[PDB]
Amino acid sequence: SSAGFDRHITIFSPEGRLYQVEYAFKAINQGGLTSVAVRGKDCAVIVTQKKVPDKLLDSSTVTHLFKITENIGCVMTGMTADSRSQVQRARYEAANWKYKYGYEIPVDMLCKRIADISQVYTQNAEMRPLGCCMILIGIDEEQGPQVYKCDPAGYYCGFKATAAGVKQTESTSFLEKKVKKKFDWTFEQTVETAITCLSTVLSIDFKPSEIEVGVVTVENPKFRILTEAEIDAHLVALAE
Amino acid sequence: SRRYDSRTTIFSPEGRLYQVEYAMEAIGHAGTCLGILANDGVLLAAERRNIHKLLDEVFFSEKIYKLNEDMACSVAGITSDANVLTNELRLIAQRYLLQYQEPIPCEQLVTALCDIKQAYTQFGGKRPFGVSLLYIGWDKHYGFQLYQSDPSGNYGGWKATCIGNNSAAAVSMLKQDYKEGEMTLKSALALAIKVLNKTMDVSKLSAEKVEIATLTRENGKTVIRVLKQKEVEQLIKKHEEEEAKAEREK
Amino acid sequence: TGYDLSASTFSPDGRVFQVEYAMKAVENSSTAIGIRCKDGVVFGVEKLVLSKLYEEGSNKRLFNVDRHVGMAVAGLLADARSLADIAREEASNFRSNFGYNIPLKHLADRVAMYVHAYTLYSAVRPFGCSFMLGSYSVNDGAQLYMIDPSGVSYGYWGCAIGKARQAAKTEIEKLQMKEMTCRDIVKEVAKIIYIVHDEVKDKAFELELSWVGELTNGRHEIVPKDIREEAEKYAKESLK
Amino acid sequence: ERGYSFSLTTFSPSGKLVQIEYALAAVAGGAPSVGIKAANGVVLATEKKQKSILYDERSVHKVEPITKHIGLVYSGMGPDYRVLVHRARKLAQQYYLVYQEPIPTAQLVQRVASVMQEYTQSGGVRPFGVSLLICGWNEGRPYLFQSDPSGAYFAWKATAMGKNYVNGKTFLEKRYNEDLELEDAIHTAILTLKESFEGQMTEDNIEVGICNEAGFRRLTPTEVKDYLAAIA
Amino acid sequence: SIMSYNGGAVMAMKGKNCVAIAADRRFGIQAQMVTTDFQKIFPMGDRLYIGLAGLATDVQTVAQRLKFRLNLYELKEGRQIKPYTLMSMVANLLYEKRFGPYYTEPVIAGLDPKTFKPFICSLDLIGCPMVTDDFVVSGTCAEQMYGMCESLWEPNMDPDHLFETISQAMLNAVDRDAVSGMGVIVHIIEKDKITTRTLKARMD
Amino acid sequence: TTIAGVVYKDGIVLGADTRATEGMVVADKNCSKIHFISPNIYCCGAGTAADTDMTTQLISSNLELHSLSTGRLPRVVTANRMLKQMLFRYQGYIGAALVLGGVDVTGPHLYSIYPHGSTDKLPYVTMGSGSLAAMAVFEDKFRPDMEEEEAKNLVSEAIAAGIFNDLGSGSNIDLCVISKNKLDFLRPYTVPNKKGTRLGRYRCEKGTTAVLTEKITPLE
Amino acid sequence: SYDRAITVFSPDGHLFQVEYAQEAVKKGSTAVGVRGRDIVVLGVEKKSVAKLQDERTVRKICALDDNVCMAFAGLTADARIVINRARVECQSHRLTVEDPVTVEYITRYIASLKQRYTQSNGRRPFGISALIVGFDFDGTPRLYQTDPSGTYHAWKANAIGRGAKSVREFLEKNYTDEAIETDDLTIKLVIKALLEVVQSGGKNIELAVMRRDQSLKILNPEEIEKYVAEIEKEKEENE
Amino acid sequence: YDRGVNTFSPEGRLFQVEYAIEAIKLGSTAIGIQTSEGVCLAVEKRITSPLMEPSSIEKIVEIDAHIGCAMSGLIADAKTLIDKARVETQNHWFTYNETMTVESVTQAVSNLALQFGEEDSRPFGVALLFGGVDEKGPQLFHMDPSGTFVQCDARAIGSASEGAQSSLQEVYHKSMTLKEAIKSSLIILKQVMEEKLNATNIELATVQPGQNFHMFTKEELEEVIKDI
């Protein structure tokens, strides 16, 4: 199943596999983190946890939610040093869309340009292919809300509900039973069904100081990050 | 970064070099081409390999490539490496014609390509080409010519040579049946169907399994004619009529 | 083995050892602590007197990047002042292009992306330094950041890097840095680095302190002699 | 930075390029796909199953157009495909800016396969892990070509790529003749993709694109449901 | 000027199922002829010609750069070149020297190979193609050739009257020009055969 | 050269003449001046006829590349942004005066691009040599939100003012109407000027021209 | 650009890629050359003809100018690119200093080209050895040879190729002063030399003499058929 | 297994610089002696074959009119250093209109001697003696493959280097004459070479304050041999 330096660099195994990429997928799992994204009928919600183990650390500088453009937000998993470098590219690629083409970049075209860059790392046998993932949300005209994931292999797809991190398979098994019964989704139900995803997988039943929620909706297309006070409003209504 | 370097350029402690000998090992298998001349005209007999029943059979040729307006080549080895060489000496002949306003002599086209082929065996840390190929053509200095290239970068003039899988068996029979300057372009065709009767293990000589192209000198034309599949099989059975006559009467 | 020679290869469980091996080189440098007060940041470095032959004021592990930004380093000292040169040069391009003094959330972002850039290729090694950045502005207050050799940065109310890291930050959270001004902090900065480094390991050591805030009128400079003599007067009362 | 500038693909002592032989193993483990030309147009049909019900199937596409009259499918790994699509999109433009003419389908495969051969010899790169099927109707007659990671190409009447490709080629050999219409070739392309799919072949588990003399186009799932109905 | 340094005149004219091209024979330097057999029409495949007029350097230079690019086209593709395709090829070659331009004005005339339909066009010195249906002219004595062709052209003409019209168009206009003359060669092509004739002009 | 455009209540009407004048001599009588960019965007060209051809093909190649990648319809502001960024780079050495018009998702949009890189969105524009004559018809008889029969009558009237008053203009009037669902490109919209009929028979016969040398070569 | 040191030192003081290339010379076909006082005579053996090839495209004796000839051994692909780089240099000497190239000058160009090429980055050394033969101005016939490490070196008689030690031992017991007496008698030394080598009994040998004012003039296999008769005829009667 | 070319030893020196020191132990031996009357400088040739022309090889070669050289170890890469020295003495004459001193020639070469690597490829495997008469009188220098040079008074380099140095420390004194320094060197070379001593196996060259660099030839040379 191995011959040559196929364990070390990005070349083909005798089985057709290539191991340096599928080693990098489980470099995401060393963060100890899990993020959930849910698309609604007229909105898009990202929820993720934050774990602050110290009192000496400033809790306002640990946000994994990042604002890419004025109308595009994202969440980052994996290791922190590679994830913040990939946000810096996505800020740069969106500004060049506006300068060259004169209008706001669609969120699927931005995920294509990130996945094309990540392809080149697993295409040359020199670079290390950036072991961190990527989840974007955004409102598109004549498409509504839409959610995309980009992995460090260069693959991407549009989702309807999304999990990434340590507890990915347990969260998606919860969500696929939720979506196929096909209830209609208001704004607050998508907030409710996203918090109760990682509250039943992780079994926490938390207070509002450990999670962070970004949202976009077609009445205010600005990507906005919720205050902990209004996080608490959805949380005490979740406990009926 | 020096741990992953494979050093495709260095010598071996016995003196020879391994990389092109592995390429000329691969040039034995996968293909069969041969040529012959003694008089007005020269031919390329090549055997097709993929004879599956689902193909379009287009592009006028399979292993024959027209290079100049009066010369062509037959190729053997890695087919993808062949497509880069064939459209490389195709414009070596054109940049000659741009410079001198005269068609290129057939010999110094071969030397120009075999210097590009030699350079990869010598520096750059680069995979050489596993491609050997034939050359027919005509020029005013010497007439009909026949050359052979090797992946090391050395060429040679010939009269009849094969680079097939059983090429040693073909050469051993070409120097058993031959005549210097008297094999006209009908006896050579009968001799061509005799040789690939031997080296092709698929017997009975399917007319779609081989390709034959001839280069004859018409006054200002130098006609390169890929002969069609309607006149192969009558040349096939003509070899078959005489062999039942010669066996029974001996 | 073989999976840990270059920084371009992951391990078969998905982590890079050349960064982890360079993180181990930090805990052989001694100790650098820095906490921020209510209205400023105070650094502190205990300096090992290796021999008598060196001069008092040699080989300072406490740099001065910009007019208001300070740096305290811990690691292989040649890589320390090499990172100090690009950070000193990065702030010069900000003032020349944008007109004003660089903020810390941008300065530590540009440096950490420069440190991260050497954790990807086989041609270069990761740095063997971790360091702290602290400053004060009149429009933003006090700031305090810290950068590991992987390239991760966060905000802190107080941090510690060196040999005894947990044994230093255990006593930092005994303080109350939210309300103290940067005068009584100077006595408390020195005290928590006398209780560390028992006299069996080192014979004698050197105190070196730093200081920034509006009491220093925004400029970064060293403490005066008389103030750090008060802290060295407040040294030998930890024997009770 | 810089590169490596040495080929990591060398000749074996048995005379075989081993990395290209391994790249064909990744092609054979891809999604199955068939392609059939019949006398007025070419049918390209593939097999696209999302792993779960959460995926949006109307987001990505296997069947891609290159120009007005050239489509292109694959069977291999995903991210390598989108690279040489964007390469082949550009190569059709530099032919058009010189000659003011849509590119022939033969000359596109001359230049796409030249990229793949150039990419298996140069320094510090692994070869592609995809094989292609390219259709198009230039000057009336249609065309159907197949490339490979080595850089060669062929001219097929009908062929299959992906898993169980050796069973599809026996199935097409007992099915295809010279005389079929386009709607007949659609019906036998679904009949050969049913050899290897799961139990439910719905309107969104497959993806079909056709050429005419009207040009290349890609079928919507409405009439794909009508072709999937009254099948097998 | 620059175009008046050597003279020259090329005319093409469309007929029924046939097309003819004509040019002068003089080579000279501003007052002084050197020879009377200078080639200005070049063959580009069967039933497709090109005429060049302008500076005598770039006439021989473009006609060799174009043949360099033509043989690469007809070997990479298995077919001959369409007359409309060569018009885009020549226009690409001249526009590359947008600021270093060649001083020539090409004229292309030929039959479409599958459907035998005539085609004529002309280009300026930086590559603006202009297809017409009656005639194109290029060279120094341009205005004299418009008075001929606007007064003599008929729409549907057999190859006999096509030859006599383009002959009287060239002989009367070039005689009125000073730096052009010394003989006129006429190529008239058609789907079955081709014809080269030289006319009895003033050697004056 | 006289090109013009207008924005009516549903779409955009563009118009032009068909003449290319080299020096003071009419070189082409049927030169088409309205170009293809996308299936919803066209452009008219003026100035150097070789510079406008090689520019309008470069941008139309990139928008075919761009729209086939995004999979949706191009926008008019993208063709505006590609043109004025590359004309500014060549510092006005490329003489290209363009009237850009199209109907994207946001509606109809009409631009005018000057060969140094300055653009402007306007409800009606004229470019070319006889543009001052065509402006006076627009300036006297424009009304916002006209019907397409009133618009086509207005543009053909304005192009005719550039025919009968400018020396370097005047032949068959081209038009094109772009709407949200219809593209009517039509070159001979009207024939304002004919050629008079010949009177004297000038006809020669075979044998009236002396031939020195003839050659015959057959083909097949 | 491929930057890698190919030729490096050994731990005892050798350059292994150099002396591996010397063994590629040590199995090429044998080339023998002596000099007379008025006519030089050098001729390779082992033509190894297979009677179906063009006899002129297999030649290993070429000319660099009118006065300078050259034979070689080793592998032929590296040879004819060193030759073509020598043809440019000896032509560029004439655009400079007006006289034709002295035979010592063209050996220093080949030897210095060959040394620095065992010194650069990412290049295996050449695998050929040469014999440069010419009669320069003022009619002084002399010859040289070139090691693959690049040490040019003059001789009175030499031989390279497969079986070169046995021929060099044969010449020292045979090279007298009166052996170079006649122009036909110096040829009888070379034909006696290569017949004491790999067999080549008139059918695989190709001598080529130069009479200090001619170009190279290869004798066809009729005088070698005549010379090998009489060289063996004198051997027939004495023993 | 394979190191790079630029690696330190655990004992700290290098690898391929130290390997090139071993390579000059295979070359032919050479002796130079500094005397206040002038610098004499000799070598053997190591003639291999009777068919070989003897004078085509050389070890003494001149750099300028007042500076000679002597090479050992390899020969083919010594000619690269000789050409850089000849150009350097002419650039100094062109720009300063004087003669470059013997010491400043040597450091102009010794800076070149350690410049290999993987950018812009191995150290040179020769060893050189530089004899010359500048304005400080006669000089004698000796460089290294490592690029380390130092003034010597009687230096013997080659395969018989350490055997000759011991026999040379006993006969040298600071008040020699050139006529006896020439004779004292050929006594040493008579011991260490393989073949017998004659007028073709060796050659000499002396540089004087009065005249320029003079190389002896096979007519004035054997009167030293017959009067040994």
Side-chain angles (χ1 to χ4, degrees), chain E:
Chain E
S1 178
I2 300 169
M3 293 293 175
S4 64
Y5 187 80
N6 295 116
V10 175
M11 185 186 289
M13 187 178 290
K14 186 184 287 185
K16 181 71 174 177
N17 288 319
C18 59
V19 61
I21 191 168
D24 55 350
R25 302 291 296 276
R26 182 185 179 272
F27 175 72
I29 303 168
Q30 289 178 351
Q32 176 184 2
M33 62 162 281
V34 180
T35 185
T36 58
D37 53 352
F38 187 77
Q39 182 180 3
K40 296 177 183 178
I41 298 170
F42 295 96
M44 298 297 173
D46 291 333
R47 289 178 285 108
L48 195 149
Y49 282 178
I50 186 168
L52 291 173
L55 186 63
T57 300
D58 298 335
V59 169
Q60 292 177 355
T61 302
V62 173
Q64 294 171 355
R65 296 290 180 88
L66 181 62
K67 187 70 175 178
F68 179 76
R69 294 181 183 178
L70 186 65
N71 296 120
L72 293 172
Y73 182 78
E74 292 182 353
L75 292 174
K76 188 179 288 293
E77 303 187 1
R79 62 181 175 88
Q80 293 180 357
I81 185 166
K82 291 181 181 179
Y84 184 79
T85 305
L86 186 64
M87 187 185 76
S88 296
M89 183 184 289
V90 175
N92 195 8
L93 191 147
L94 297 174
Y95 189 74
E96 293 176 354
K97 303 295 188 292
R98 176 61 180 86
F99 298 99
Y102 294 109
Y103 293 100
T104 185
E105 291 177 352
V107 169
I108 298 168
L111 292 172
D112 179 76
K114 293 182 176 67
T115 300
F116 299 98
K117 181 179 178 181
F119 179 77
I120 52 172
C121 68
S122 69
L123 285 79
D124 55 355
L125 61 94
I126 52 173
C128 178
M130 292 178 186
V131 291
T132 58
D133 293 330
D134 47 357
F135 59 94
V136 290
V137 291
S138 293
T140 59
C141 55
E143 294 86 3
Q144 292 83 14
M145 294 188 286
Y146 288 111
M148 285 287 106
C149 293
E150 288 289 330
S151 299
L152 295 176
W153 184 72
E154 292 177 353
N156 292 319
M157 301 181 73
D158 54 350
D160 291 332
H161 292 170
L162 184 63
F163 173 71
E164 299 295 326
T165 298
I166 195 168
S167 298
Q168 298 296 321
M170 286 298 291
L171 293 177
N172 292 318
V174 175
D175 197 7
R176 185 60 64 187
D177 195 6
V179 296
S180 298
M182 308 303 291
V184 175
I185 188 168
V186 172
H187 297 283
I188 170 168
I189 79 170
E190 64 188 4
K191 67 179 293 297
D192 292 332
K193 64 182 181 294
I194 198 166
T195 301
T196 298
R197 293 189 183 96
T198 63
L199 297 176
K200 182 178 183 292
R202 291 177 66 89
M203 299 299 287
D204 187 75

Side-chain angles (χ1 to χ4, degrees), chain G residues 3 9 115 119-120 153, chain H residues 51-52 80 118 121-123:
Chain G
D3 294 332
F9 287 101
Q115 188 277 129
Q119 185 63 252
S120 177
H153 199 79
Chain H
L51 298 172
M52 189 183 81
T80 305
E118 295 292 327
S121 67
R122 63 174 174 85

Side-chain angles (χ1 to χ4, degrees), chain A residues 20 26 30 56 61 82 126 128, chain C residues 8 10 12 14 116 119 155 157:
Chain A
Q20 287 292 321
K26 59 187 177 182
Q30 292 180 358
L56 296 175
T61 60
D82 288 335
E126 183 176 359
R128 181 179 63 85
Chain C
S8 297
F10 285 103
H116 175 268
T119 58
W157 297 98

Side-chain angles (χ1 to χ4, degrees), chain A residues 7-8 20 23-24 26-27 30 54 56-58 61-62 79-82 84-85 88 126-131, chain C residues 2-3 7-16 109 113 116 119-121 150 152 154-158 169 172-173 177:
Chain A
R7 299 287 182 182
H8 295 85
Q20 287 292 321
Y23 288 162
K26 59 187 177 182
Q30 292 180 358
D54 294 333
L56 296 175
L57 190 146
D58 194 1
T61 60
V62 292
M79 62 182 72
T80 306
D82 288 335
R84 188 172 174 84
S85 176
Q88 186 60 253
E126 183 176 359
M127 301 175 184
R128 181 179 63 85
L130 271 75
Chain C
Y3 291 100
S8 297
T9 67
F10 285 103
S11 70
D13 55 352
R15 66 184 188 271
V16 181
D109 196 3
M113 294 300 108
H116 175 268
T119 58
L120 292 170
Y121 298 96
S150 69
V152 180
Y154 292 116
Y156 288 98
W157 297 98
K169 68 183 290 185
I172 294 174
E173 61 187 2
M177 71 289 290

Side-chain angles (χ1 to χ4, degrees), chain C residues 1-104 106-138 140-198 200 202 204-218 220-240:
Chain C
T1 59
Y3 291 100
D4 55 350
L5 293 176
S6 176
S8 297
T9 67
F10 285 103
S11 70
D13 55 352
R15 66 184 188 271
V16 181
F17 289 107
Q18 288 291 322
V19 178
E20 290 183 351
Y21 290 163
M23 287 182 181
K24 193 184 287 184
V26 179
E27 293 90 7
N28 301 116
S29 294
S30 65
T31 293
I33 62 101
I35 68 102
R36 53 96 65 84
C37 73
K38 186 177 184 292
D39 52 353
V41 180
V42 173
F43 287 151
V45 167
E46 57 92 16
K47 182 178 176 182
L48 268 66
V49 178
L50 293 173
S51 69
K52 187 68 183 296
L53 296 175
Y54 294 103
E55 188 178 1
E56 296 294 327
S58 177
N59 61 14
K60 293 182 179 181
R61 295 178 64 243
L62 185 143
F63 287 147
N64 195 359
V65 175
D66 201 73
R67 299 174 66 190
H68 59 284
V69 178
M71 183 183 285
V73 298
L76 183 62
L77 266 296
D79 292 333
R81 60 176 64 92
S82 295
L83 287 174
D85 289 330
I86 53 96
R88 184 178 292 119
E89 196 271 335
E90 183 70 28
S92 177
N93 299 120
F94 191 87
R95 186 179 297 115
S96 66
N97 293 319
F98 289 154
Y100 68 102
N101 292 320
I102 183 167
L104 260 291
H106 192 197
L107 178 60
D109 196 3
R110 299 294 294 164
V111 176
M113 294 300 108
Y114 185 78
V115 177
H116 175 268
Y118 288 169
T119 58
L120 292 170
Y121 298 96
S122 66
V124 293
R125 79 190 188 192
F127 289 105
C129 292
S130 180
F131 63 96
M132 297 174 71
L133 294 175
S135 179
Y136 181 77
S137 177
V138 297
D140 294 331
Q143 299 293 318
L144 182 61
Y145 286 153
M146 187 271 288
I147 293 96
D148 57 352
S150 69
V152 180
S153 67
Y154 292 116
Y156 288 98
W157 297 98
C159 180
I161 46 174
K163 288 188 264 76
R165 180 174 179 177
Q166 294 87 19
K169 68 183 290 185
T170 302
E171 290 84 4
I172 294 174
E173 61 187 2
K174 270 75 174 175
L175 271 298
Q176 185 66 42
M177 71 289 290
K178 301 296 293 295
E179 64 189 4
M180 295 177 186
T181 60
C182 280
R183 181 63 56 84
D184 298 333
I185 288 299
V186 182
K187 293 185 264 74
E188 295 293 325
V189 162
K191 182 174 74 70
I192 56 98
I193 53 97
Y194 288 113
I195 60 169
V196 75
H197 75 280
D198 53 346
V200 179
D202 192 5
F205 67 100
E206 178 177 358
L207 176 58
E208 182 177 1
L209 295 173
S210 177
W211 189 53
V212 73
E214 79 269 15
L215 199 150
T216 65
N217 209 169
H220 183 206
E221 71 267 13
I222 202 166
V223 296
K225 291 184 178 68
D226 54 353
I227 299 173
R228 69 182 181 181
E229 288 295 326
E230 292 291 328
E232 291 175 351
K233 185 65 180 295
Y234 189 68
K236 304 297 183 289
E237 290 81 2
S238 68
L239 56 87
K240 62 184 180 294

